[PDB]
From Swiss-Prot, chain A:
Modified-residue entries (Phosphothreonine), positions: T58
This protein's encoding gene: KNTC1
Localisation: Cytoplasm; Nucleus; Chromosome, Centromere, Kinetochore; Cytoplasm, Cytoskeleton, Spindle
Subunit structure: Interacts with ZW10; the interaction is required for stable association with the kinetochore. Component of the RZZ complex composed of KNTC1/ROD, ZW10 and ZWILCH; in the complex interacts directly with ZWILCH.
Tissue: High expression in testis.
Complete-protein stretch covered: 978 to 1089 of 2209
Signal peptide: none
Biological source species: Homo sapiens (Human)
Function: Essential component of the mitotic checkpoint, which prevents cells from prematurely exiting mitosis. Required for the assembly of the dynein-dynactin and MAD1-MAD2 complexes onto kinetochores. Its function related to the spindle assembly machinery is proposed to depend on its association in the mitotic RZZ complex.
Name recorded for this polypeptide: Kinetochore-associated protein 1
From Swiss-Prot, chain B:
Protein name: Centromere/kinetochore protein zw10 homolog
Tissue: Widely expressed.
Residues of the full protein shown: 586 to 682 of 779
Any further remark recorded for this protein: Overexpression as well as silencing of ZW10 disrupts the morphology of the ER-Golgi intermediate compartment as well as the Golgi apparatus and slows down ER-Golgi transport.
Species annotation: Homo sapiens
Described function: Essential component of the mitotic checkpoint, which prevents cells from prematurely exiting mitosis. Required for the assembly of the dynein-dynactin and MAD1-MAD2 complexes onto kinetochores. Its function related to the spindle assembly machinery is proposed to depend on its association in the mitotic RZZ complex. Involved in regulation of membrane traffic between the Golgi and the endoplasmic reticulum (ER); the function is proposed to depend on its association in the interphase NRZ complex which is believed to play a role in SNARE assembly at the ER.
Superkingdom: Eukaryota
Protein's cellular compartments: Cytoplasm; Endoplasmic reticulum membrane; Chromosome, Centromere, Kinetochore; Cytoplasm, Cytoskeleton, Spindle
Length: 112, 97
């Protein structure tokens, strides 16, 4: 159990270092405040990565027959360390869209 | 027996069709190829969930489990064949697969 816990701690540290280039001490690492802050920061980042992709203007001649990697996949690469599944991501997005006054996007996600 | 398997082949003739959007599981780097692949996989599990709910407490335990295993075998052996017939799998593909 000691080795499994220590392995989990170093796995989290290495995943956070490689996917984010964030380097601190273990006292700053184990503090849940930074974990929650980085979780909400990349929740907001995922909000924008799709919000810009709802067309507010005419599309650009980019990703034409050669489509760019999805932002959701990069967010999931980041969140594999954060242990956030798709259900929790959709739950958080529903509340965040509800706070923005967007009703349809929350109802559609609830229905799905 | 023959009446029951007539329902099985009708159900299989749905699952493979729901996998028609899998696009041979190629070019996972594209966002559309990832979305259209998730669309097939969600619906394949959803069909079996509802079918199992329908057949719940109707068939005996042995035959229900055997029929479910038989349907899931066809569901999984198609994805396995699609993956083993691929040619290019990059680092991004190895994560989304």
């Amino acid at each position: 159990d000691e080795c499994e816990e220590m392995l989990k701690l170093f796995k989290e540290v290495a995943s956070l270092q490689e996917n984010f280039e964030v380097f601190l001490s273990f006292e700053d690492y184990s503090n849940s405040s930074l974990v929650a802050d980085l979780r909400e920061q990349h929740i907001k980042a995922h909000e924008v990565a799709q919000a810009k992709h709802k067309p507010g203007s005419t599309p650009e001649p980019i990703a034409a027959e050669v489509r760019s990697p999805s932002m959701e996949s990069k967010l999931h690469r980041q969140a594999l360390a954060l242990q956030m599944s798709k259900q929790e991501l959709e739950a958080e997005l529903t509340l965040r869209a509800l706070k923005d006054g967007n009703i349809k996007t929350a109802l559609k996600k609830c229905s799905d | 027996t023959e009446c029951f398997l007539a329902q099985m082949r009708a159900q299989k003739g749905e699952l493979l069709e729901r996998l028609s959007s899998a696009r041979n599981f190629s070019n996972m780097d594209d966002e559309e190829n990832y979305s259209a692949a998730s669309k097939a996989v969600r619906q394949v599990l959803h069909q079996l969930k509802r079918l199992g709910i329908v057949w719940q407490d109707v068939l005996p335990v042995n035959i229900y489990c055997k029929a479910m295993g038989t349907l899931l075998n066809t569901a999984i052996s198609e994805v396995i064949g699609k993956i083993t017939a691929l040619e290019d799998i990059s680092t991004e593909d190895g994560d989304r697969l």
